[PDB]
Amino acid sequence: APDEITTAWPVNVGPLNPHLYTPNQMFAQSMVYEPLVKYQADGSVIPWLAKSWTHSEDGKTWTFTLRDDVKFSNGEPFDAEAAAENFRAVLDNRQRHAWLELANQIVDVKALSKTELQITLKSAYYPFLQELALPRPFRFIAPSQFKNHETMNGIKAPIGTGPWILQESKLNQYDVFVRNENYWGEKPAIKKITFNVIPDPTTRAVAFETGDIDLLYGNEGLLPLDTFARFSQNPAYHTQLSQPIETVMLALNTAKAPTNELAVREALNYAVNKKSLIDNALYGTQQVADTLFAPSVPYANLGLKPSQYDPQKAKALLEKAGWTLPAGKDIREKNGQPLRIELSFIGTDALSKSMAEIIQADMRQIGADVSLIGEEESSIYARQRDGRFGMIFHRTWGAPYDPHAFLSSMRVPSHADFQAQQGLADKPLIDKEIGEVLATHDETQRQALYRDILTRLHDEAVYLPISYISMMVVSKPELGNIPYAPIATEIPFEQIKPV
Numbered sequence: 001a002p003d004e005i006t007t008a009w010p011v012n013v014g015p016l017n018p019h020l021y022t023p024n025q026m027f028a029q030s031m032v033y034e035p036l037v038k039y040q041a042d043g044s045v046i047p048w049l050a051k052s053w054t055h056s057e058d059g060k061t062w063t064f065t066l067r068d069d070v071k072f073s074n075g076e077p078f079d080a081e082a083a084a085e086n087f088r089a090v091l092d093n094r095q096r097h098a099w100l101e102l103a104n105q106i107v108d109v110k111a112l113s114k115t116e117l118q119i120t121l122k123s124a125y126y127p128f129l130q131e132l133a134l135p136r137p138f139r140f141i142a143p144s145q146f147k148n149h150e151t152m153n154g155i156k157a158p159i160g161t162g163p164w165i166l167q168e169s170k171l172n173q174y175d176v177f178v179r180n181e182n183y184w185g186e187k188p189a190i191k192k193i194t195f196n197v198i199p200d201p202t203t204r205a206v207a208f209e210t211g212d213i214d215l216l217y218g219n220e221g222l223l224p225l226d227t228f229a230r231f232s233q234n235p236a237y238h239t240q241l242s243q244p245i246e247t248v249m250l251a252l253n254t255a256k257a258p259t260n261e262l263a264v265r266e267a268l269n270y271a272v273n274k275k276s277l278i279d280n281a282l283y284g285t286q287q288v289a290d291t292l293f294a295p296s297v298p299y300a301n302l303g304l305k306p307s308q309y310d311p312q313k314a315k316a317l318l319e320k321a322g323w324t325l326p327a328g329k330d331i332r333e334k335n336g337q338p339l340r341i342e343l344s345f346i347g348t349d350a351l352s353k354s355m356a357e358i359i360q361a362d363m364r365q366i367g368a369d370v371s372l373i374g375e376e377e378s379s380i381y382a383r384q385r386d387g388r389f390g391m392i393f394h395r396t397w398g399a400p401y402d403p404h405a406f407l408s409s410m411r412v413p414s415h416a417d418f419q420a421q422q423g424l425a426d427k428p429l430i431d432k433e434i435g436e437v438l439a440t441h442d443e444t445q446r447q448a449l450y451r452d453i454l455t456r457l458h459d460e461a462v463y464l465p466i467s468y469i470s471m472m473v474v475s476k477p478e479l480g481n482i483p484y485a486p487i488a489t490e491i492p493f494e495q496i497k498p499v
């Protein structure tokens, strides 16, 4: 069966609720639901569901001209009314979509013609279109699929206008998608796709080796990085390491002891040996990260000073900061307390645990005792809102979120970044400039803003950049080159031309 292919994923696709996050896997959501406008690599956008559009001279009111020849998955019709209903459906939950400034920007939406769609915003929002193209929450599910007239409280059956229809899902085993025969665009060469739920990376590797897996698409965690290196040397397989897409780092808690002290945060930076960590835990397959964003990220090439591995400098800062060594002890104490710091991570994540132990051992050489708290992913995401952490693995989102959406998110008190930045005297001002960066049409004002924000976050040592990671692919040679989607979180299955 060429028309058909099997792949893998650590967890099920989820309910495929277009307007909800966890556990709805993004790539999947992007398979079923579509946007009015679609994101391009050049950073621009092309018309999609919205055939073309028009805007008020004052740029606050927008009117899109939808496609008529577009039928929802279940034969139903896609029109301005369903659209308005989705937006409305989404906005009824605006509070949680607070991270995406477009959310708290939509004044209201209403249906003009059967195909005319009018959107008015509080302001002439320049990130309007690029933010509609996102995988969520402004995608569309048939109105005839709510739990009342609400999607925030669940949906009926995941039906959209995508080219892929979730034909079947079975907890802990697989998720099946079939080609949507009544799609409005080009016909996807693959007719069926099957995702095998396989948590372990080593298992995913063997799974591929049996011949039962056509492809493996994911990030640094896909399969063990050394096996991937053996795999790329194998004539019968095919592998690919994309260039960096986002950065992984630790987030230090400024609003909590002892990470409430700039000295301790700076010292934590000079104590970790990135390379040794990278070469040893990531198998030299990814690259070292000095700043929150790589210099190749628009607006981020700021010449920020990299903190180099320097145990020497490390313990010197720490002591001047009042954390001295007591007779007969390896760990530093201040006014009675030891320099203990807890590091939370997904206990069942082989990668996090490794960098964890390395970091732990690195810190111990400067008199700091870090405790590893490997926990359920649910408790981890919990401590991120709660702010119950000392240090915490965290990562950016790749294009097109980085850097504007990811910054926007820092303002919302419902996330790790906000939480970690809390105890910063700069915070109020930083959030002020993020809203301003999202608000100015002047490129030079924008350049300066990103500079001020990113320089503060950097100088105040909020994070401990570790590495810029890549997307990897392992596939059967018959599938040819596996393309990358402009949106970092999507998998371009429709482009895969088998044999």
Ligand SMILES: O=C(O)CC[C@@H](CC(=O)O)C(=O)O
Pocket: 021, 026, 099, 134, 135, 136, 137, 397, 409
């Ligand atoms: O799914 C998205 O579009 C953004 C979700 C984001 C976390 C959040 O803001 O709740 C993330 O973890 O990437």
